[PDB]
Every structure is written in structure tokens, then in C-alpha cells.
């Protein structure tokens, strides 16, 4: 990662929390590291705007870089002219996080309720249970995001607190 140049500066400091307010983060470390990767791409993005048209460096190291941005699910395909790459911004990597995509797809009624649902052995995307909120969905995995076979809200067990609630009824009311 890299720290930004100025640590305390008014229009940027409040611009932190309006990112922390919508997305629901916990550390500006999880903001700065995202800008850090966007920093390294963007320097490379300006490199291929200097060289010649139809350079195979501008082809092979350009278009695959363009297609990888379509592959991560950020660059829409209409803007596929390598001139929207400068017009990228911070929230689009924040938008492709595994936490926020849960709330967009119904099912969470918050961005903070979905944060708790990541770390409790719930929702998987493929057959792998994901419990890191920054899993960065690749746009070919959206309509596989679903409740687990186990871990209720998905069924076949009601769980240790629902079974304990069942246990209380049998011992005092019943036997």
C-alpha cells in the first residue's frame, strides 16, 4: 500500500466517511489500499497513451489490460476505447466488493447486515464459502451468489439457538 500525501485535509477527510457511510467499511486502510492498486494501473494507463497507434505493446499490453477491466466487472463494454480508463474513479472498485453486492441483490436490507452475514459461515458464491468481504466478484459469478446448503436461511438445520429455543419448550412445558 501507500499512504496519501496529506493526512488531514478538510474536503478529503469528510469524503472519507461518505465512502464509509455508503459502503460500510472499518478502516481507511481498506480505502487507501484500493486507491493504491488504482494508482499503479493508472500510471500504466498513461504510458500507452503516449506511444504509437496500433503498437503491439498498445495491443497486447493494452487490450488485455482493457479486457481484464471488463473481466473484473468494472469497465462497461460500451466505454471500450481506452479513453474511459482515465475516467475511472474510486467507488467502482468499492462497488465490486463482495459485501456491497449482497445488499444490491436483495437479501441484506443494509450494508452492515451483510457484513455480519459474511463472517458467520453463510453465503457462498460458488461451492466455496466466502468469508472475506473483499472477494471482488468477476461479473460471471453474480447470479450464483446464494444462501448455503447448510447454515439456515438455507435449511436442513435450524441451528444452535433455534434448537436451544426448541429445547426450552420440551423441558418446562412438556417433559
Amino acid at each position: 500500500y501507500s499512504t496519501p500525501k496529506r493526512p488531514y485535509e478538510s474536503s478529503r477527510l469528510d469524503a472519507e466517511l461518505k465512502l464509509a457511510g455508503e459502503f460500510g467499511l472499518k478502516n481507511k486502510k481498506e480505502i487507501y489500499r484500493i486507491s493504491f492498486q488504482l494508482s499503479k494501473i493508472r500510471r500504466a494507463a498513461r504510458d500507452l497513451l503516449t506511444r504509437d497507434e496500433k503498437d503491439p505493446k498498445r495491443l497486447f499490453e493494452g487490450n488485455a489490460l482493457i479486457r481484464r477491466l471488463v473481466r473484473v466487472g468494472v469497465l462497461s463494454e460500451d466505454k471500450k476505447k481506452l479513453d474511459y480508463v482515465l475516467a475511472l474513479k474510486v467507488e467502482d472498485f468499492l462497488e465490486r466488493r463482495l459485501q456491497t453486492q449482497v445488499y444490491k441483490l436483495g437479501l441484506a436490507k443494509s450494508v452492515h447486515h451483510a457484513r455480519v452475514l459474511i463472517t458467520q459461515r453463510h453465503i457462498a458464491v460458488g461451492k466455496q464459502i466466502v468469508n472475506i468481504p473483499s472477494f471482488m466478484v468477476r461479473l460471471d459469478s453474480e447470479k450464483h451468489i446464494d444462501f448455503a446448503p447448510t447454515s439456515p436461511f438455507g435449511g436442513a438445520r435450524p441451528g444452535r439457538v433455534a434448537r436451544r429455543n426448541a429445547a426450552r419448550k420440551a423441558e418446562a412445558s412438556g417433559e
Binding site: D14, L17, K18, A20, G21, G24, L25, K26, H112, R115
Partner: peptide
């Protein structure tokens, strides 16, 4: 050592602050 802070830790402190910020913002712009 003091028993003074009771204020939450980590994520829950950032949620409350955002809500307060929005409330403050509604007034002055409106």
C-alpha cells in the same frame, strides 16, 4: 485508569458517525 469510555469499537462507531453526519447535513443545505 478511568471507567469513562463506553463507546463502541470498530465498525459500529463508523456507522453512528455517518448517521449523525447525514443529520447535520440535512439542516444547512436542506
Amino acid at each position: 485508569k478511568t471507567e469513562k469510555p463506553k463507546k463502541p469499537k470498530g465498525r459500529a462507531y463508523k456507522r453512528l458517525l455517518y448517521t449523525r453526519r447525514f443529520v447535520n447535513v440535512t439542516l444547512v443545505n436542506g
